[PDB]
Amino acid sequence: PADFKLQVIIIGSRGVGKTSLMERFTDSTVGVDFKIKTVELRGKKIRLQIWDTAGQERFNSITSAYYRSAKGIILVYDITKKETFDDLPKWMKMIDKYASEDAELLLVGNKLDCETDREITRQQGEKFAQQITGMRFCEASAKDNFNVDEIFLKLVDDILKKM
Numbered sequence: 274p275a276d277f278k279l280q281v282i283i284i285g286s287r288g289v290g291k292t293s294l295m296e297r298f299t300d301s302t303v304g305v306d307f308k309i310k311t312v313e314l315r316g317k318k319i320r321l322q323i324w325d326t327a328g329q330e331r332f333n334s335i336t337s338a339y340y341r342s343a344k345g346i347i348l349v350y351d352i353t354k355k356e357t358f359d360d361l362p363k364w365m366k367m368i369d370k371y372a373s374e375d376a377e378l379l380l381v382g383n384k385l386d387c388e389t390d391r392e393i394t395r396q397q398g399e400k401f402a403q404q405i406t407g408m409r410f411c412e413a414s415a416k417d418n419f420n421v422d423e424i425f426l427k428l429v430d431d432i433l434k435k436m
């Protein structure tokens with residue numbers, strides 16, 4: 274049996290790869306889906322519930338409920354679509370309103386495989402995360418399976434440390 278059950282949520286604007294990231298890592302209720310994954314991490318069995326939320330603003334009200342329960346939040350943008358990076362303050366406002374104060378946060382620049390179409394630099398993503406105390410950052414590619422395990426596993430590691 275599992276040592277821990279944890280909920281994490283994936284948020285961000287539409288088309289950034291939130292569903293692709295969740296499905297690459299793993300395999301009705303309005304505005305949300307979820308996958309369950311049992312991970313082994315530092316000898317601990319963790320039953321992970323990953324909520325995948327709607328991206329459009331009209332769904333903020335529904336999805337807000339799932340923020341409070343989240344022990345970790347993955348906020349995703351698309352490195353090739355600058356407006357998904359420009360939306361991040363809106364997502365940070367959603368976090369301030371609804372997340373737990375103790376929620377762990379991770380910023381992800383997804384679509385690293387599309388490096389030639391890059392609109393946002395790595396420094397931009399790093400500097401954004403750095404402004405938010407405790408927020409981790411990395412770039413990933415759901416398509417190329419780069420940093421996919423790592424965004425979930427690192428976030429889980431951060432969560433477990435702080436309990």
Ligand SMILES: Nc1nc2c(ncn2[C@@H]2O[C@H](COP(=O)(O)OP(=O)(O)O)[C@@H](O)[C@H]2O)c(=O)[nH]1
Nearest residue numbers: 287288289290291292293383384387414415416
């Ligand atoms: N090239 C590339 N395309 C991606 C990546 N991740 C997602 N996509 C594509 O982006 C589009 C939207 O992704 P989706 O998972 O539905 O985004 P969501 O709205 O955030 O759930 C789809 O065409 C995906 O195949 C990636 O890492 N690289």
Ligand SMILES: [Ca+2]
Nearest residue numbers: 420421422423
């Ligand atoms: Ca990996």
Ligand SMILES: [Mg+2]
Nearest residue numbers: 291292325326
């Ligand atoms: Mg989706």
